[PDB]
Structure formats: C-alpha cells, structure tokens
C-alpha cells in the first residue's frame, strides 16, 4: 500500500508551489520549520483541508481517495484528544462502538480491543483512569498511546500523526516511536511530522521529506538525506546531529537557490519517472456518545459537584435571607426580588454551558471527519448527556429548598410550575449560550458577548425598568430577552392569590390607588397578562427559543469550516 | 571577578544535596532536565530564594554577598518582562531613572543608554514600539535584547539569565548569544541556564555545569565535558550532538551510580583544592513609575478605549431606555432601577481592575528584588497611573450623559454628588478587587471570588431584599457591601425633593398609606437616613473601605513571598 501525489498548489495565498513524491509501506517523515508546509502537507494527504484549495491528485494503489478513505484511516491530533476523565477500557469501547460494524459481536468488541491494548503495552492501565488536572491518572506518554489505540480499531492500514514528539519528554517519546516502529513492519504506513527531531528518532525511519517556506527540498528514503546534502556544497562537521544539520542549511548557516538544486536532484528524477507511471447506525450512534460524556460528567466533581455546592449553599442563603415572605408592604419587593434573583442565576450560570462546546470543539472536529457520528447524533446525544441532567438538577435544588423556607405559594401545582419554569430558562439561556458559542474556539470572546447580552436582557426583564414606560420604538426589544419570559412566568406563578396591604381587602375595591394592594395590581402594572394563557405564553416562547437556538447551534455545527 | 559556593542544602524537601564550584569571568552554563536543579541553582547564586532555605555560602572575590549585590547585578526573567506597549527609548529611560544616581545628569541619562542601545544593535528600533498582540511591533528576538538592556544600566559586572534560548527561534537565539558572547569578553560574567541546548551554542562557552534530579555531575570549563564522559564508560557516537549526548547518559541510554563517579572526579578535586582556599529618591521613584504605566495606558486602546466605548454606548442606551423619568407611580421603579444599574456597573466593571496586578505580578516581583522602588512608591504610583484616570473617566462619562437625558434632579450640587459617588464606588470596588487579587498569579480564581462576593453584595444593596425585613442575625451583613453605600447615597441624592403620586401632594399628609407617594417614604422604607449626615456617612464608609482595602493590598504586596 502506497501514497502518491503530484502538482499540489494550495492557497487560501499559496504557501506551497507543488510537491512530488510517493510514500512506501514503512515510516514516512516530514521535517522542517513551523512556518514551512510541514503541518500543511500532512493535512493534505489525510484529506483534512479544503479540496477546492487542493490542486493535484492523491493516488493510492492505482486508485484515488474515495469517500471510504476517512472511514478506514487514522489521524491523531497533537493535543490529548483522549478522555482523561475516563479510563482506557472505557474509551476504547467508545471507539469500538462507532467504528466497528453493527453486525459484529460484542464479544468481537471485547476481543479486538484486547488485540490492540495488549499491543500498546497498556494492559496495566486498562481500568486505570487516564488523567485530569484534578484527578491523578496515567502519565502523558501513554495518553499519546491512548489516542493511537483510538485510531486502530477497524485496523486502518494507513496511519497519520500530528506531531508525535511534541508534548512528551525525551525518553518518553522513544517508547512511543518504538511502538510505532513495531507498527512500521506490521503493514501499517505511518505518515507524520516532527518539529525539532533527533538522531535517535532519525535512525529508524524508512522515507523522508523536507519542507521549508512552502518549498520542497528532499524526497526518498531517509538514509540518503545525509548523502545528498554533501553534494549540495556542505559537509556535516564532526559530532553534529544530522537532523539538526539538515536545518543548518536553511537559515543561512537563498530559498530560491536551494530549490533549484532539488529540481536538478536525481532523487527527484527517479520520482519523475515514477509518478508519471502512476499519474499517467443512529440508535447505536446515540447509545454510546451519550455514555461517554456522561462518564465525563461523573468523572469531574470540580465541575459537576462544584456547581451543586454553589447551588445548595446559595439555595440555603436565599433560604435564610428571605425566610417566610411577609404579606405586608415590603412583601412585593422581596418576592419580586428573589424571583429576579433566581432567573438571573439560571441565566448567568448558563454561561458555564460555553465550557461544554468550546473545550470539546477540537475533539468534535477530529471525530466527525473520522466519521464516528452524524452531526445530529452528536447533537441529540451530548444534549442528552450534559444539557439534560446538569440543568434538571439545580432547577430542583433551588426548587426544593427555597420554596418552603420562603413560603412561596403553598399549592401543589405552583411548586411544579416554578420547578418547570426554572427548568426552561435554564435550558433557554443555555441554548443561546450554545447558539453563540457554536463554532468558536475562543472562550474570552463569547463569554464577554453573553455577558453583554444578558445585561441588555436584564434591563428588559421588568424589574430594573417598567416595560410599559419605554418609548415605543424600544418596546419591541422586550421580546428578545430570556430573563423576561421566565421572570414573567414566576411573577405570574406567584402573585395571583397574594395580598400585600394587610388589613386592606383590596379585591373588591382598591380605595386610594397608587397603592399596589394585591398581586394582580403589581402584575398588570408590570405589563403582564392575567389570563392563564399569559403563564404558558412564556413557556412556548421559551420552547421556541430553545428549538431556534439549538437549530442555530445545529447549523453552525453543520456549516462549520471543519477543514 | 568570580563567583563561588560550597555545601548548599536547599529544602522547602531537599531537591539538592550540595553543589561545589567557582565561576570565572566568562560564560557560565547550567544544563540538564527541567526536574533537575538547573532552574533552582541559578536562583541561589542570584539570591532569588529564601536564605533560610539556603545552607552554604556565596563568596565573591573574597567577600560575601552584601545588601548591595542585588543593586549592582542583573537577572532576566524567561518571559518578556519588557513593556511591549512602549518603545525601547522610553523603557530604557525608565530603568535609567530608578537605577542611576540622582546626582547623575539627564545628559548622562541620555548618554549611558546610547552606550548600550548602540551596543545591542537596537538603534533601528529605538523609537519603534516594541510590540503587543494588538499593536504590531519589534520581533521577539529583540524583546529578549530589550530586557537585557534593562539590566545593563549601571554597568553590572555580574549577569544572570533565566533561559536565554526558550521562546526564540533557532537563528533568532544565536544573535542573542553572539551578543552575549560580545559581552563574554567585555568583563561581564554571564551565568544562565538552557533547556535543550545545541552544539552551535555549546561551542562558545567558557565554563559548564550539569544538574540532574538535584545531583551535580560536572564542573569546570566547557570543552572537557566531552573529554570526561568518555572515561565514565561511554563513547560519543558518529555524528551526534555533544550537548544531547550529555543527556544520553541521564535517562538510561542509576542516579546514585553516576554521582559517585563525580565524587571521584579529578575536576572536583582541583575545585576541592580551590574552594577551601576560598572558604578557608522617593519623589523620583514616583516621577517615572507613574509615567511608565501611563504609557501602557495610552498604548492599549483595546483595554482603555474599549472600556470607554462600552461606557459611552451603555451611557447612551440607558439614556434611551429611561429618558425623562416620570414623576408617576412607575417613577420609583425606574429611578431605583437605573441607580441600582449604575452602581453594579461601577462594581462589576471593577473586576477589570484585577487585570492590573495579576498581569503585572511577575514584573512586580523581579523589579522589587532588583530594587527599582520602595513598595509604597510602586503603590503610590500605579494607583496614580491606572486607578486614578480609568475610574475618574467613566464616573464622568456616565455622569454627563445619563444625567440630563434621564432628567435626574435638576440642581447643580446633585449633579456633582452623583459624580463623586460613582467615583468612590468605582474606587471602592476596585480597592476590594485589589485587596483580594494582591499576591495571586491566577486569574480564574480571584475573578470567581469577587463574582461570588459582589452577588452576595448585590442582595444586601437594598433592591433585591428590603434590608429592614431581614432577620437580625443577618442585618449585620448589610455593612460589608460596597453596592449598598453607593446606592444608598444615590438614593439619598435623588429621592429628596421628588414626588411620585401625581395630583397627590403628599408632604403635608399621606392619606391612605401603603402608598409611597413621596421620595422620603421610599427612602425611609428602605432603611436609609434622611439627615444630611446620611448621605456622607456612605462616603466616609467608602473612604475607609478604600484605605483598608488598599492597606490589605499594601500588606499583601509587602508580606508576599517574593522568593
């Protein structure tokens, strides 16, 4: 099995001109500087770029790349894309589920992992948790081994690796490469790229390629690179690293002069007489994606439990501040105070939903181009795994605690209307948080955006300005605010049977107005309906704002530039 | 001029045993792994650690280190401690001001820079801005040159460098080291430490030292390290880097075996017969520190102007939402709504004052141990440079815009009471932000803490809960809240002459209470004084909370573990 390619022009700006060569079944290496194309050619051969940006061909065993090529090959991203919150046995049963056939047995899913984890030397760390900052786990040298086993499930013949040495120590990385050297002879074509290599790494290759500022300088087997650059005019001095002496040529102990040597290279001319011979299921896809982030959710107390501890404590403090809300003249200020405080929590804690996708963005990109899932199966699964339980709970933790301490309206249904309303505004402000943050790798931008947006929703929620007393070319903005509809519903839920002028039965007559002596007089003066549609109008507003903002999140995850 | 040392035990945990050697006037190099003591010994000889943690001696030319040793020597931190927002001519006039004598002429301050910037090759980039992420400037290879010139002002004979190669490219770092090689012969003793060195770097030294896991393995000149480790049992193979072959010994192609070779090293025995021969003004300090951060403040529109654009726009939006606050039944909700919104801005924008010290923490540590300032001179200067102008302005931008659009109380003094009150709560919430964040290098912790603290101040400010209706074992917490005192003052400033029941003169009698038909009835019911002390009580509360929280910030910057 061989790779091959010819006349590749890649632009957005051509940081390449054309690259020519073939890659044998063996150990294919790309070296050079970071500004060079050493990271861009590898995304070309692994089809990780825009095909309209691509110009030339990729021909494999006399066949072009099909749609089946990504589904039988493996590229490994430079950072740890593994689930360090899970273990190796758990994570390799994930990648067995979405890559092996549905017809294949769970026994076969038990065995084919064990043909691989036994090969990687990871039999010690099978059920050992891989490792987080906050949970001690396996050393990072086998986190690199963990991701390679994630890309060896269906036995891909063609292996790709983004920077197998960077991120690891010196003898740490050698145990990776000898494992890859064991893979170098079992019929597995490893094609990778190393910044700042070493002669201990250099002594074990099979083929080699140098790129510098988008220009090609070497092709062929790896031994003869030292043999060729002697004829270029240099000499490798006594006791120098050869892989570092290969970069001694580059930056002036000019680029146009060295490439003209390569056009007249006999290593090119054999390749010139070689390339022109050549150029001449969904329920299962939701069964295991929901489980994987679920064990991410259990395997992080500092993000799951630590947001319950904030919820329980602030559940109890608000239980102590308010405590039996009186039906006196101060009663309106307290009841409208806590319900404005709950809804804004619900909203200002939904900024933590941006922690979900932005951290999982780079894992989303690699896993879909690999083809582990349809995008909706990611999207009907992770919302089942993280959007559902982490927002059902604080909408019950707030609801069970602060209801009977404060003495909010002592009926059965209104306990559950408040339970459901905080549940929706938790979802709805999370959905907007997903809608903005979908397809953004930056945190500090989108976190600032919702912080702007929620504040411009806080004003129109009804407490900080009376919504009927806004100029009528702004009173259309009161519809675009999630803290309005929840806080409208909670004010609708609670202020119905209440009274606030003790001694003054107001429901028959209110003598001496400007008084606000019943709950309806507060509720109408805020511009809120009294018919029972006016409660659930808010929910179907919020239900539509969930579906719209998830769809904008679904389209941004669909129309994303994955390449 | 030589350094020397003997029998150094350093604990908190002894990650050392004892290190012996001298350092000639030349080029002194420390190599090894990151877990080794190669970064810890350099802080020992430059006195950057706890002297109680130190055991042995540091003897210089037959004299111990005085208090004058830090005032005539230079250590350069690994990251860019330069002011990339300023230029080289501006930044080297800073380090000329705080290091040269007060008797020395400004002409001499013009000349001695020009003896150095001419030496560094930085004459092209003299007035060129050095560089930010958001302002294009000089390349990072001369940012490293910029910091060395900051530590060559009073001509220190003894130079120290934290990691002179890390952070720069290959040929980028050589132009640094050849400059240091030019310094290696002008009578300047450079003592540094390099992770992952190279033979182009290795071929120019004068003395050499290896550390590994707190153990010493070499001392002497740099040529003979390749000569010595042959006798240890190895041989440097054909075409290998010698400085990388010196780490080939370390991690098993054990630590106790290789150190016993060094006890029986003849390079140690000459040193054993060499060490035992040896062992046998404030206004000026505020004149220029205030200027330097001032030009940091001008040289960052994305942090200075971008917090005015937010202030002007939200100045205008609040001008449009409210716009001529009516004296009707909704008038209480609007006026108490905006004043609660202004004070919480003032407070929740003071979270951006944590951006000040936490970023400038590592520059504060290096510059005080160098001795550029007394700590109060840093502290009376930077508050003059950043705390003063960036909080005088939005307390005028809010004040000029939203006063006459909204029609807040049309008197002359109340315009300036509101101007001054927003100025204090800007300072006071910034002072707490300085008091918490002083001595913390983490951002995400302290930003979370004030976000917790301001929310537990937002409740007690008086809008979300009526303060008189709290249980009396919590009504002492209403004093520990900055958004109370400002919002108390703004409610005191504005609700005096107002009326809110139109048609109903309330100041003679209020028939039919529960009404809130004048501004005092709202103001008393919140539990706020009506005497004119009750206004300025809030200010002297806030003035004391500035001085206390700055003192806690002054003590945390004083009692900090600088080492």
């Amino acid at each position: 099995a061989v790779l091959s390619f010819h006349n590749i022009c890649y632009r957005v700006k051509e940081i390449l001109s054309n690259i020519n060569g073939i890659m044998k079944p063996g150990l294919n290496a790309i070296l050079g500087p970071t500004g060079g194309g050493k990271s861009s050619l590898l995304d070309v051969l692994a089809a990780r770029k825009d095909p309209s940006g691509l110009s030339g061909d990729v021909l494999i065993n006399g066949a072009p790349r099909p749609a089946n090529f990504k589904c039988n090959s493996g590229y490994v991203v430079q950072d740890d894309v593994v689930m360090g919150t899970l273990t190796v046995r758990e994570n390799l049963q994930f990648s067995a589920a979405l890559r092996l056939a549905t017809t294949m047995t769970n026994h076969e899913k038990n065995e084919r992992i064990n043909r691989v984890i036994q090969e990687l030397g990871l039999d010690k760390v099978a059920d050992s948790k891989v490792g987080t900052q906050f949970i001690r786990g396996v050393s990072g040298g086998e986190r690199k081994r963990t991701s390679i086993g994630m890309e060896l499930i269906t036995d891909p013949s063609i292996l790709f690796l983004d920077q197998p040495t960077t991120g690891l120590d010196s003898s740490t990385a050698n145990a990776v490469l000898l494992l890859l050297k064991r893979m170098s002879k079992q019929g597995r074509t490893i094609i990778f790229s190393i910044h700042q290599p070493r002669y201990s790494i250099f002594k074990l290759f099979d083929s080699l390629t140098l790129l510098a500022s988008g220009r090609l300088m070497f092709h062929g087997p790896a031994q003869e690179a030292l043999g060729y650059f002697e004829s270029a005019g240099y000499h490798c001095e006594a006791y120098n690293n050869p892989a570092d002496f290969f970069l001694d040529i580059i930056n002036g102990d000019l680029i146009e002069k060295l490439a003209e040597i390569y056009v007249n290279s006999s290593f090119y001319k054999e390749t010139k007489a070689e390339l022109h011979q050549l150029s001449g299921s969904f329920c299962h896809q939701l069964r295991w994606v929901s489980k994987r982030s679920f064990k991410n959710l259990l395997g992080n107390p500092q993000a799951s439990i630590a947001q319950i501890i904030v919820t329980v404590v602030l559940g109890l403090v608000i239980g102590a501040i308010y405590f039996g809300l009186k039906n006196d003249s101060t009663g309106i200020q307290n009841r409208a105070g806590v319900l404005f405080f709950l809804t804004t929590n619900q909203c200002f804690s939904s900024v933590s939903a941006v922690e979900l996708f932005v951290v999982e963005k780079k894992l989303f990109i690699h896993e879909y181009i690999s083809g582990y899932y349809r995008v909706s199966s990611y999207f009907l699964g992770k919302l089942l795994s993280d959007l559902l339980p982490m927002r059902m709970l604080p909408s019950i933790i707030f609801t069970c605690i602060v209801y009977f301490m404060l003495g909010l309206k002592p009926k059965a249904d209104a306990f559950f209307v408040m339970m459901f309303t905080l549940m929706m505004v938790a979802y709805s402000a999370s959905s907007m948080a997903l809608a903005i943050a979908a397809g953004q790798s930056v945190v500090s931008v989108a976190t600032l955006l919702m912080t702007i947006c929620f504040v411009f929703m806080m004003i129109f929620s009804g407490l900080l300005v009376n919504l009927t007393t806004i100029a009528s070319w702004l009173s259309w903005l009161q519809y675009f605010s999630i803290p309005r509809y929840g806080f409208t519903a909670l004010q609708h839920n609670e202020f119905l049977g209440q009274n606030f002028c003790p001694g003054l039965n107001a429901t028959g007559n209110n003598p001496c107005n400007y008084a606000t002596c019943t709950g309806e007089e507060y509720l109408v003066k805020q511009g809120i309906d009294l018919s029972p549609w006016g409660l659930w109008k808010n929910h179907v507003a919020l239900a539509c704002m969930i579906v719209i903002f998830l769809t904008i999140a679904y389209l941004k995850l669909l129309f994303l530039k994955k390449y | 001029a030589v350094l020397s040392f003997h029998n150094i035990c350093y604990r908190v945990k002894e990650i050392l045993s004892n290190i012996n050697g001298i350092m000639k006037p030349g080029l002194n190099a420390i190599l090894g792994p990151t877990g080794g003591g190669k970064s810890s010994l350099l802080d020992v000889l430059a006195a950057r650690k706890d002297p109680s943690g130190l055991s042995g001696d540091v003897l210089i030319n037959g004299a111990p280190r005085p208090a004058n040793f830090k005032c005539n020597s230079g250590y350069v931190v690994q990251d860019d401690v330069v002011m990339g927002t300023l230029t080289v001519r501006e930044n080297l006039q800073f380090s000329a001001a705080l290091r040269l004598a007060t008797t020395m002429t400004n002409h001499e301050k013009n000349e001695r820079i020009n003896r150095v910037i001419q030496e560094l090759g930085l004459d092209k980039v003299a007035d060129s801005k050095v560089g930010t992420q958001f302002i294009r400037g000089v390349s990072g290879g001369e940012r490293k040159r910029t910091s060395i010139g900051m530590e060559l002002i009073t001509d220190p004979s003894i130079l120290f460098l934290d990691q002179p190669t890390t952070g720069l490219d290959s040929s980028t770092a050589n132009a640094v080291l050849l400059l240091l090689k030019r310094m290696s012969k002008q009578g300047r003793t450079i003592i540094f430490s390099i992770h992952q060195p190279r033979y182009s770097i290795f071929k120019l030294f004068d003395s050499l030292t290896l550390l590994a896991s707190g153990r010493l393995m070499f001392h002497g000149p740099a040529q003979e390290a390749l000569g010595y480790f042959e006798s240890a049992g190895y041989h440097c193979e054909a075409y290998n880097n010698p400085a990388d072959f010196f780490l080939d010994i370390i991690n098993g192609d054990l630590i106790e075996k290789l150190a016993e070779i060094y006890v029986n090293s003849s390079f140690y025995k000459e040193t054993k017969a060499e060490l035992h021969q040896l062992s046998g003004s404030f206004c000026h300090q505020l004149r220029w520190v205030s200027k330097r951060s001032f030009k940091n403040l001008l040289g960052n529109p994305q942090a200075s102007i971008a917090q005015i654009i937010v202030t002007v726009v939200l100045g205008l939006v609040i001008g449009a939402i409210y716009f001529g606050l009516k004296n009707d039944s909704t008038g209480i909700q609007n006026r108490a709504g905006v004043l609660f919104f202004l004070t919480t801005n003032q407070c929740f924008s003071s979270v951006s004052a944590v951006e000040l010290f936490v970023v400038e923490k590592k520059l504060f540590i290096h510059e005080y141990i160098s001795g550029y300032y007394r700590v109060s001179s840093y502290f009376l200067g930077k508050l003059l440079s950043d705390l003063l102008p960036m909080r005088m302005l939005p307390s005028i931008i809010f004040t000029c815009i939203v006063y006459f659009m909204l029609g807040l109380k049309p008197k002359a003094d109340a315009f300036f009471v509101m101007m001054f009150t927003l100025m204090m709560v800007a300072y006071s919430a910034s002072s707490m932000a300085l008091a918490i964040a002083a001595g913390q290098s983490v951002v995400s912790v302290a930003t979370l803490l004030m976000t917790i603290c301001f929310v537990f101040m937002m409740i007690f400010s008086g809008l979300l809960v009526n303060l008189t209706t709290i249980a009396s074992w919590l009504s002492w917490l209403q004093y520990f809240s900055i958004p109370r005192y400002g919002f108390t003052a703004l409610q005191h400033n504005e609700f005096l002459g107002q009326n809110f029941c139109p048609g109903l003169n309330a100041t003679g009698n209020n028939p039919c209470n529960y009404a809130t038909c004048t501004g005092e009835e709202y103001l008393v019911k919140q539990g706020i004084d009506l005497s004119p002390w009750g206004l300025w009580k809030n200010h002297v509360a806030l003035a004391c909370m500035i001085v206390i929280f700055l003192t806690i910030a002054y003590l945390k910057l004083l009692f900090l573990k600088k080492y």
Epitope: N510, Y514 | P502
Partner: antibody, heavy 118, light 107 residues
Framework: VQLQESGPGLVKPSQSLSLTCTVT?????????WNWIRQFPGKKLEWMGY???????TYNPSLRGRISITRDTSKNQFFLQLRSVTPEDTATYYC????????????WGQGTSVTVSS | DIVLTQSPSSFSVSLGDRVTISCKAS??????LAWYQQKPGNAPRLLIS???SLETGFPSRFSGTGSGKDYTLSISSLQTEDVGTYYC?????????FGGGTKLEIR
Amino acid sequence: VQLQESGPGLVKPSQSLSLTCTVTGFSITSDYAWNWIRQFPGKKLEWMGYINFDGGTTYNPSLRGRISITRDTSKNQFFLQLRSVTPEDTATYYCATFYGAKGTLDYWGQGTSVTVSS
Amino acid sequence: DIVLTQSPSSFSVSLGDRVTISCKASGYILNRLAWYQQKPGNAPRLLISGATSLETGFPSRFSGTGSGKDYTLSISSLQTEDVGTYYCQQYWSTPWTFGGGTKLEIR
C-alpha cells in the same frame, strides 16, 4: 373646586390658541394636578394633559409639541397654549381637576368652544 | 395604549328598565374604571369611581359590576333625568382614553 375658562371662541388656522382657567375655592399650588379636556363635535372626549401642583407636566402623546401648559401661580391660573392649530380640532375645550388618590376627574370647567376657520 | 370600546354605541329603552351598558377594555384595568354622565351642554359629571363605588349625588341605582376587562354599568329602573351620554374611562395608564360613549334613547 371652582374652575372657569375665558378665551377666544374662534381662531385663524395654523397659528396658535390661548385659553386660561382661573381656579377659585382652592389654590393650584396646594394639592391637585390640573388637566385640560377637549370634546369634539360628534362627541368623543379626549383628555389633553395635566400640569402637576409643582409645575411638572405630562401631555397626551397624540398631542406632541403642539400643547403646552404653563402656570401663573400668583393668581391661580394655568394656560393652554395650543400651536399650529388644524381646522379639524375645533372641539369644545375644558379644564378639569384630578385627585391623584381617588384617581378620577373630580371637578371640571364650564366649557369653552373653539372654532378653527377663516 | 388602552382603548375602551363601548360596543353598544346607543340604546333604545323605556322608563323603569334595567339597562346594562358594557365597556370592554383593551387591557386589564383592575377596577380603575370611571363612569361619567354628560347631559347635553355640560361637562361630564362623575358617576362611579373604582368601577364598583358610587359618587354622592346619585340614587342607589347606578352600580358598576366589573371584573378584569369586562366592566359594565347597571342602571336598575332608570328615570327621566338619566338619559345622557355615558363615558367610561380608564385611569390605569397615563393616556387616559375614554370610551366612545353610549347614548340612551326613549322608544
């Protein structure tokens, strides 16, 4: 308690209008808010805007920039200055009296008619 | 704003009849619903404040029974002196719109 208008019962179009409501039995600086009412032929009432007891005022937002109410406190008067008068608003005008706490138009004027023709 | 549709713009009743004048609101008024009575050539005399109260200077026949939006006036066994033009007013908001004003007749 006792209100009365006195003004021109005619005007040229598109210039101005002046009415004056002199209040006896009570002082307009004491308690209430003081508002004007017009009633069209083809009778539909249309409240116009109140001046408060302390000179503040709020006008009916259909009549923006056209109505203004001033007051001369030293003899208990408050003035109707209605500018750029179209011939369509040839209504019967009134001055009236608002309690604030009772909430209703408790006392009214006598009734002045304005005909806007030429 | 709040418009006050007196949907029965007129009537045709006889003496001693219980007539019921509706006043449909375009929003919740919460008993802030006045009633006036303009005899021809006069200013509107106030009849009922609060939508349930009454004003001194009338028999106990005029009686408002309103709730929510559907406010109405009940005139049990009207007299000769009670034909007029009954205007309902909201005094909830600031643009105090009145009703269209029904007008009683005699068959």
